[PDB]
Design a protein around this ligand. Sequence first.
Ligand code: ZN
Lengths: 134, 272, 123, 120, 68
Amino acid sequence: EIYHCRRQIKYSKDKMWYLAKLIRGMSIDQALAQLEFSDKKGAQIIKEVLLEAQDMAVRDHNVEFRSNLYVAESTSGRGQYLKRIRYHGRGRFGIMEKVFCHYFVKLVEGXXXXXXXXXXXXXXXXXXXXXXXX
Amino acid sequence: XXXXXXXXXXXXXXXXXXXXXXXXXXXXXXXXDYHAEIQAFGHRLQETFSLDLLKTAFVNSCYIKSEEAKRQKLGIDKEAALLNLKDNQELSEQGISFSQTCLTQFFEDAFPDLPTEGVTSLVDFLTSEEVVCHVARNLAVEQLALSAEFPVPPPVLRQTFFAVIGALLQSSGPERTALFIRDFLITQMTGKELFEMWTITNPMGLLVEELKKRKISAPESRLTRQSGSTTALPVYFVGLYCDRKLIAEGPGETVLVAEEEAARVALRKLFG
Amino acid sequence: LRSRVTDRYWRVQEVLKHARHFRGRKNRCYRLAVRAVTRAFVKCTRARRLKKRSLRTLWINRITAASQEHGLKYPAFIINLIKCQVELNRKVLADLAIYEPKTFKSLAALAKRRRXXXXXXXX
Amino acid sequence: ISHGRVFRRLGLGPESRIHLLQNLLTGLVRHERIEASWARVDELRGYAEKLIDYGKLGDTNERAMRMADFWLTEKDLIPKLFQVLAPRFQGQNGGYTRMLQIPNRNEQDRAKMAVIEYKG
Amino acid sequence: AAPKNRRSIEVNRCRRRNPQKLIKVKNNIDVCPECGHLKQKHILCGYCXXXXXXXXXXXXXXXXXXXX
RNA sequence: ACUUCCAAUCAGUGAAAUUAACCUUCCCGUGAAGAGGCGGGAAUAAAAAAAUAAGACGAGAAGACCCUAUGGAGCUUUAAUUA
RNA sequence: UUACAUUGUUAACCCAACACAGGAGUGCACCAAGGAAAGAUUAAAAGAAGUAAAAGGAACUCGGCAAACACAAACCCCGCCUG
RNA sequence: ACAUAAUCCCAAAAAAACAAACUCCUAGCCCAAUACCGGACUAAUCUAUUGAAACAUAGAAGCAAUAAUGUUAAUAUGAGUAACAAGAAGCCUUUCUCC
Ligand SMILES: [Zn+2]
């Protein structure tokens, strides 16, 4: 498995998670194209992370075929918070919290296989007949 | 002290993500000796003889091969454990044969009306590896078993169990064995599975064979009534008779399954 | 001078250990865990007290059903069983009302027999 | 309501809008091709065609002259428009002011970019 | 107005995930007919065009500087 | 009816008071006498966004009216007592 | 008596917790000085500022408030008035 | 004859049973509680003794926390909501436009 991580980078975790779930389960190529033409602040960063992950995959692991690489797991954690003073009216100060995001990428070789297909009639006729016999 | 409880909590929490394999030598906390085990073995069970054969019964070829392997590797000294396995295999051989004879006698005396095929099936199921090994593991024979490679695998515990059997055959004679085994096996069965594995192929035809052999009467299936249900399952009432005399009656979801169950009930009915 | 040490943390750890499988902060936070634990124990006691009532009612319903199958109601069957000097519990009576229809049929027959003999002796 | 209405707003006043059109058209006629937002471009098309047609009317004609002087203040654009750019489009009717799309977006507002160009 | 009580995790997740559908993924990817590079659909390439547009801008600046 | 700045959308930076926990419907009654948590009926697959301000005796101020305390302070005198 | 010296200017602006539509002294220009509403879309409700209107012209309302157009005339209370 | 949707708790019906910390049976740690009073014990610190990475014999307390619009710190909710930000073309530096 090929792991890559980026910490102490300042971006919205909730916003980066949008592009993080986007490439999860998807193949390297499709994820690359997506992140390239995806419009957001996380697009560039996650693109860099992916590119570095591919470079590490090729150089360190010495992978024979690049097409056998896909994205198995992607996650976004929260780092330290920078507290800033936001000046408001009537002599009151609010607390502006600048967040941070630690991006983690876990890659596994082999062809990507994901099936979300579920037959309704089969699952119903099986679960009902098994629940009636229990 | 807080250090000992933090260390105990850390060890107890470390054992959750790490599971060590079971070891046979470090299994028992107290020192394991041959005489202690055979002594308790003699105190629990009614009669126990031939301590040498009893110890040999728990000895497996793997432990001997591994021991000799270590002897050759290190090259320190040389000893001969060879006689153990050679003495064990004979006890196992006689054990299997006498077990077959004894169980055959059991099925012959208990169920005289049972056809040869049924006898063969019940014997094959009763002498099956999985069941006997399950009884073994349930009797905690694995604790008394000696295996160098691994304690768990069935080829060890099974051969060990049969060796114990044969040991009881030679030492204690048949009269004691007949008390021991016959008690456990029956208590283990408890199910309908006994006649179910013999019913796995053409239940109807088997009933035809039995009836033609005994009363020489061809079985006839006739639908006596039908209560339908379109939603879940329809219910057909199927009678099964010979010479106008009804042998059995039963409901079914489909005609096939209904005939199968009717043939099964009729199959166990003629068993007596 | 003493210290808080591990005592409070161990008590919280124990309560939260008993707070497992609970929903939300109650399986996380300590206070809500305690509040839920008290209710859990009270409900334990109360439901263990009313369990006999529920089982009794269920058994009475079953026996009532099996009785009505034979043409007589539950109270008449009870009275007949009382005058028959039958101390049999309704649990076993329900078990017979399910698995062994023959025994319940015999008891119902004797019930109708005692009822008819009493109605004929009263007239 | 927006029902049946051309002549968009784009967050600018009438004078600001007209001046914007004059500036974008200035750059367009000057460089022969320009890059701007898709809305401003699509809006600029029609006015560009109009100025071209006004150039096609006549050089001596006063109506076209004062119209051209009204929209374009710059003295450099007019002779290059009439003498050079106009005679090549003489045969064309709707064949000027082509619009194309730009692959990337701005790093700030990510505004969709488009280019307007006359036929060479 | 002010919130009556603190939001639970479940409601937050169900609100921030399902209805927004995250980011819907369509296919914008198409191969450039010229250089064969991967670019956006219904749009000019970002390889064989931006360099030619910069060369055309430098040629227009050089022509405008030579004419003056 | 129109114009512009907001509201609305997208992207960047990312608050606040409030908050016991919340799976949070309605009616008729009851409950310290005004119930989404009680009872009985009616209604209802699961989650948002742009809007309306009836309810959650909404949020915000330990009522500034009333009274209590052998509370405080200002002001005034033929209250009493006097450097 | 060397009174041919010593300091400072010319650096960038600052007071209101803030790179805050609020604040101040002196001389003269109003421009050849200086600042650009320096993220983008949408043309909903609704709000703020602004523009226009058929016919009536205060029928509104506590009051011609507000507001486009204008200020012709009447009569009282109080205070003289400039403050 | 009162003011949101009906029936005085569902539906209906017609004109001797079910059913409680009560009693009995079965076992034993033998028969509730607010204020208040009494008895017997556990967790933690330290000291004397003993034992040495887990304890009991006593003595000595800053000795057991869920609340005080508590204190301090961390982290949420509101919320990706309010709020902050209208010239343009080019080109290496100009032109046009606005106040
Ligand atoms: Zn290309």
